[PDB]
Amino acid sequence: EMSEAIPFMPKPANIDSSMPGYAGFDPLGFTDYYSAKWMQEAEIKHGRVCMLAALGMVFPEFAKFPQFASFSTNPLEAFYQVSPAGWGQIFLFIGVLETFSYEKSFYNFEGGAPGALGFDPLRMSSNPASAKQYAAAEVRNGRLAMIGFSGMLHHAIVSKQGPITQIVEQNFYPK
Amino acid sequence: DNAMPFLERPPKLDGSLAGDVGFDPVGFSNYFDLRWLRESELKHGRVCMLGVTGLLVQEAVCLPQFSNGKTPVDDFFVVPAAGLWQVFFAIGAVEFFSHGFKLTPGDMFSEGREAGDFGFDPLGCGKNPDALARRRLVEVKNGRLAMIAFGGLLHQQLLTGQGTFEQLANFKAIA
Amino acid sequence: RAVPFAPAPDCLPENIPGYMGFDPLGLSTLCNVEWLREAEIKHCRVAMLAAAGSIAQDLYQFPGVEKIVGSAKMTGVHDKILAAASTGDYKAQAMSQILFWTSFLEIVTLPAVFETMNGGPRKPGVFFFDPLGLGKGDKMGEMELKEIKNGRLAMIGVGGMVHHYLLTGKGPIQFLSGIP
Ligand code: CLA
Ligand code: CLA
Ligand code: CLA
Ligand code: CLA
Ligand SMILES: CC1=C(C#C/C(C)=C/C=C/C(C)=C/C=C/C=C(C)/C=C/C=C(\C)C#CC2=C(C)C[C@@H](O)CC2(C)C)C(C)(C)C[C@H](O)C1
Ligand SMILES: CC1=C(C#C/C(C)=C/C=C/C(C)=C/C=C/C=C(C)/C=C/C=C(\C)C#CC2=C(C)C[C@@H](O)CC2(C)C)C(C)(C)C[C@H](O)C1
Ligand SMILES: CC1=C(C#C/C(C)=C/C=C/C(C)=C/C=C/C=C(C)/C=C/C=C(\C)C#CC2=C(C)C[C@@H](O)CC2(C)C)C(C)(C)C[C@H](O)C1
Ligand SMILES: CC1=C(C#C/C(C)=C/C=C/C(C)=C/C=C/C=C(C)/C=C/C=C(\C)C#CC2=C(C)C[C@@H](O)CC2(C)C)C(C)(C)C[C@H](O)C1
Ligand SMILES: CC1=C(C#C/C(C)=C/C=C/C(C)=C/C=C/C=C(C)/C=C/C=C(C)/C=C/C2=C(C)CCCC2(C)C)C(C)(C)C[C@H](O)C1
Ligand SMILES: CC1=CCCC(C)(C)[C@H]1/C=C/C(C)=C/C=C/C(C)=C/C=C/C=C(C)/C=C/C=C(C)/C=C/C1=C(C)CCCC1(C)C
Numbered sequence: 415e416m417s418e419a420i421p422f423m424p425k426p427a428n429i430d431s432s433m434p435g436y437a438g439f440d441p442l443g444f445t446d447y448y449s450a451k452w453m454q455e456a457e458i459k460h461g462r463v464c465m466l467a468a469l470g471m472v473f474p475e476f477a478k479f480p481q482f483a484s485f486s487t488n489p490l491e492a493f494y495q496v497s498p499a500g501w502g503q504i505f506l507f508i509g510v511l512e513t514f515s516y517e518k519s520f521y522n523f524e525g526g527a528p529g530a531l532g533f534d535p536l537r538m539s540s541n542p543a544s545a546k547q548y549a550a551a552e553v554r555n556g557r558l559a560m561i562g563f564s565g566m567l568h569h570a571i572v573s574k575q576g577p578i579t580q581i582v583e584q585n586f587y588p589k
Numbered sequence: 590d591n592a593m594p595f596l597e598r599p600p601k602l603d604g605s606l607a608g609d610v611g612f613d614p615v616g617f618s619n620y621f622d623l624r625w626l627r628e629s630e631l632k633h634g635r636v637c638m639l640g641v642t643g644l645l646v647q648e649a650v651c652l653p654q655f656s657n658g659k660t661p662v663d664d665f666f667v668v669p670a671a672g673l674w675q676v677f678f679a680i681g682a683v684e685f686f687s688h689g690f691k692l693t694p695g696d697m698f699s700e701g702r703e704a705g706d707f708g709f710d711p712l713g714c715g716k717n718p719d720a721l722a723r724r725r726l727v728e729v730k731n732g733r734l735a736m737i738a739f740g741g742l743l744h745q746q747l748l749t750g751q752g753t754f755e756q757l758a759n760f761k762a763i764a
Numbered sequence: 765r766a767v768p769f770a771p772a773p774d775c776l777p778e779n780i781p782g783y784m785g786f787d788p789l790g791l792s793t794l795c796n797v798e799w800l801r802e803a804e805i806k807h808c809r810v811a812m813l814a815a816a817g818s819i820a821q822d823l824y825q826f827p828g829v830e831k832i833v834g835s836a837k838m839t840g841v842h843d844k845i846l847a848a849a850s851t852g853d854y855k856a857q858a859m860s861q862i863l864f865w866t867s868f869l870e871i872v873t874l875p876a877v878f879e880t881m882n883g884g885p886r887k888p889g890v891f892f893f894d895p896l897g898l899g900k901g902d903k904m905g906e907m908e909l910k911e912i913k914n915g916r917l918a919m920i921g922v923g924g925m926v927h928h929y930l931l932t933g934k935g936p937i938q939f940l941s942g943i944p
Contacts, residue, residue: 517709533794534790534795535790535791535793535794536770536788536789537773537790537791541691543691543699544691544693544695544696545695546695547693547696550695551693
């Protein structure tokens with residue numbers, strides 16, 4: 415049996431079609447050494463943070479909250495323009511949200527599905543076909559947001575502006 | 590008949606769908622779901638029939654609460670931002686409710702709908718079966734025509750900048 | 765169900781006072797239902813006091829306050845009394861007094877809301893406060909829903925009153941009397 419993603423390599427033994435974004439892609443066999451379900455949970459959390467981060471790098475191009483209206487549209491400067499009381503409140507809120515993952519991982523590790531923090535308020539994923547599609551879509555949009563945020567971060571390092579601004583001014587290359 | 594007699598007829602295009610003249614050279618329906626493609630074709634078609642009606646009407650009529658653009662495509666740019674956003678969310682509401690909150694190719698057809706049916710016949714024009722067959726063919730062909738026509742009307746209005754009927758009554762070749 | 769489109773989660777039991785199938789956003793899946801019920805009863809009662817006080821602070825005012833408060837309406841009175849207390853004024857400590865006693869009351873009634881979640885006998889919101897005995901001696905249960913309905917209405921009404929003031933200096937009676 416060979417891997418779907420890299421057809422000339424053998425299939426990575428510890429990933430399976432059961433996993434939503436499975437492509438058979440583990441050329442360096444991380445799952446051969448680390449727990450596949452731990453890696454699965456880490457990829458989903460990184461994707462969820464990145465999906466918000468990719469929207470966050472883009473969104474104050476359009477509109478800013480009135481209090482932070484004076485803040486810069488380059489995200490890497492608006493990071494330092496926020497007060498430490500504000501960053502402390504963000505860190506506390508992320509801490510409160512992360513207590514549930516600290517309780518899921520490290521205590522009931524084997525009970526559930528990777529990334530399942532009991533957050534389904536609109537009762538989606540009830541229909542099985544919808545649940546299948548949403549599982550794969552969350553993984554794929556999370557991976558895309560990881561790549562996209564990685565891009566936009568380094569683009570803000572080179573051109574000292576945000577994504578849309580760099581595009582509009584056509585500042586695509588190191589000046 | 591075969592639309593492209595030199596090419597072999599596509600294998601999945603059986604005559605059951607209306608408007609089938611065996612025209613799929615590029616080779617869709619060999620990769621994608623024909624239910625999805627047909628529902629997409631009717632959606633594009635019905636949108637474009639309303640779109641060409643909108644272009645022709647807005648070239649003449651204007652609601653008193655709205656400004657008037659030079660052309661019906663410049664009519665988009667004098668309607669308040671909130672108005673465009675309200676129409677967008679209203680259409681989104683329709684798209685959610687009419688499709689049973691199942692909007693992706695993985696789940697849109699998992700309840701067994703036929704492509705393009707929303708149970709929409711208040712006047713009961715589809716009461717007759719054979720008349721329904723004829724109007725199915727009429728709908729898909731007028732929809733295809735309105736797709737092309739909308740492309741033509743929009744690009745000519747962008748190019749000349751003088752409407753559709755005004756363009757015809759004041760035709761001025763490319764110089 | 766309140767919304768045929770989006771019904772209430774199964775987390776919500778249907779035996780609670782004021783259950784009308786309304787939770788389209790699934791907010792009872794995101795927290796303890798006992799905590800949420802307790803929180804809405806407390807919000808209801810605080811808002812009922814706030815709304816009745818907003819109306820009363822317009823129709824009739826307690827003696828002497830016009831020298832300490834002038835003609836400020838509902839949001840303004842809070843800020844102006846705290847302004848006067850910011851100097852050393854003795855006769856402007858109504859805010860500190862109410863804050864002290866409500867904080868003391870919430871401090872000593874604090875274990876109650878944790879006993880209810882822990883499986884305790886007391887139901888959400890019940891402090892057994894029935895001095896007149898009217899609700900107790902008579903069959904009780906209609907008064908619960910009357911409390912919840914008036915409390916929800918009071919929350920929306922406070923919202924209205926405050927924001928109507930934040931736009932126009934009229935209070936409740938002045939804003940209702942005319943129509944700018
Ligand atoms: C629930 C019914 C409802 C209600 C109460 C309204 C109310 C309103 N609409 Mg209408 N609208 C509706 C449904 C509704 N809409 C639907 C279903 C459609 C699509 C078929 C539209 C399409 C539409 C257009 C095309 C326009 C409006 C505009 C307006 C607003 C004019 C205000 C103004 O001049 O200064 C207010 C000025 C502002 C800058 C504030 C923004 C306007 C607020 C946010 C309106 C909020 C309405 C609310 C979100 C309901 C929409 C629900 C959604 C499903 C459509 C007014 C509040 C006009 C507008 O907003 O111009 C400004 C406008 O051009 N509407
Ligand atoms: C919130 C809005 C919303 C949502 C959730 C949907 C949802 C859907 N649409 Mg619809 N659509 C919308 C708005 C929306 N639509 C509008 C405004 C138009 C133009 C009138 C269309 C035209 C349209 C066509 C022609 C087709 C779909 C299709 C689909 C499905 C595929 C999902 C997808 O990839 O697109 C999800 C889409 C979005 C998240 C946003 C759509 C916005 C598009 C790009 C239109 C952009 C605006 C337009 C150019 C100008 C409108 C001006 C007006 C607001 C005044 C899904 C049922 C396809 C389908 O069902 O066939 C299989 C299809 O063929 N849509
Ligand atoms: C959220 C509640 C709230 C808040 C913050 C305020 C705050 C204020 N009020 Mg308003 N007021 C309220 C409720 C409130 N009031 C209610 C419910 C009423 C009666 C309808 C009034 C009637 C009122 C008048 C007539 C006046 C004020 C005034 C004032 C100011 C001075 C303090 C004072 O004398 O209070 C007076 C408040 C009371 C006498 C309220 C007592 C009602 C209690 C809560 C009933 C409790 C029943 C029960 C036995 C208790 C349950 C026990 C159980 C928990 C164990 C201050 C801004 C004065 C001012 O300067 O405004 C211009 C003023 O003239 N208030
Ligand atoms: C619409 C008002 C309303 C109603 C119907 C209830 C009903 C109830 N309450 Mg609740 N409560 C309310 C308001 C109300 N409450 C407010 C505002 C407070 C905060 C002080 C409380 C605090 C409270 C506690 C702490 C407890 C209750 C309890 C109870 C229950 C048994 C007691 C009983 O039957 O008294 C019936 C009460 C009334 C009929 C209210 C009398 C209102 C009178 C008729 C008029 C109010 C005048 C007011 C000052 C405003 C004047 C108008 C203004 C514009 C000038 C019952 C569900 C107890 C419980 O759940 O367990 C037994 C309990 O422990 N309540
Ligand atoms: C879970 C849950 C629900 C929910 C929910 C929520 C809040 C869901 C939120 C979903 C979000 C925020 C998804 C965002 C994904 C972003 C992506 C894929 C961006 C990638 C960027 C890219 C590719 C880029 C780029 C760029 C590059 C690098 C170069 C640049 O010069 C330019 C460019 C811009 C092109 C609800 C509440 C409905 C209830 C339900 O019961 C349960
Ligand atoms: C389903 C349903 C019903 C319904 C309904 C509705 C609302 C039906 C609406 C149907 C419509 C609006 C059909 C429109 C078709 C337009 C076409 C084919 C394009 C024409 C233009 C062309 C060819 C051109 C051109 C040109 C180009 C490009 C450039 C120009 O310089 C020149 C030129 C002008 C020559 C109802 C409500 C009755 C009830 C029923 O129970 C259920
Ligand atoms: C088949 C089918 C049917 C049908 C049908 C119909 C009516 C089909 C008709 C289709 C038509 C008329 C298509 C016309 C396309 C025009 C194009 C692509 C030109 C683009 C211009 C460009 C790119 C440019 C440019 C340039 C610019 C502006 C600057 C200048 O320097 C010049 C330059 C030129 C270089 C129906 C509906 C009955 C259904 C049926 O079951 C099957
Ligand atoms: C429990 C119990 C006891 C007790 C007790 C107590 C203290 C009972 C008190 C009960 C109270 C205070 C109920 C008040 C509810 C207020 C409402 C519903 C207002 C809604 C506002 C609206 C709709 C509005 C408005 C608008 C207008 C008009 C003005 C505009 O400018 C603004 C706007 C347009 C928004 C006793 C002592 C009996 C013993 C007993 O044994 C146990
Ligand atoms: C005095 C004091 C302060 C203060 C303060 C306060 C108390 C500020 C007030 C805050 C409040 C209570 C805001 C209310 C929000 C409720 C809303 C918007 C209703 C939503 C319901 C909707 C949209 C629909 C409901 C519905 C309808 C139509 C019927 C169908 C069902 C449904 C769809 C559910 C300051 C800040 C001034 C500072 C000062 O130093 C001290
Ligand atoms: C296949 C076929 C078979 C046999 C016959 C045949 C003729 C030989 C052949 C046909 C061939 C051909 C060549 C057919 C030709 C097909 C073509 C080129 C169609 C072009 C379509 C373009 C459209 C609809 C643009 C839409 C833009 C929009 C809506 C922008 C909107 C905008 C938004 C919202 C934001 C900005 C504001 C505006 C600007 C308003």
